[PDB]
Amino acid sequence: MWKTPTLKYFGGFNFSQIL
């Protein structure tokens, strides 16, 4: 539920982590 918006809005930002 919290990860959903994390990969959507914060997705492009996670590029550093989810790289």
Q: Which two tokens stand for residue 8?
A: 């959507």
The answer to whether 14 and 6 have CB atoms below 8 angstroms apart is yes
| Contact (CB, 8 A) for 8 and 1 | no
Distance CA(6)–CA(13), nearest Å, equals 9
Q: What are phi and psi of 11, to 5 degrees?
A: -50, -60
One-character DSSP codes across 1-19: --SHHHHHTSHHHHTTTT-
CA distance 7 to 10: 5
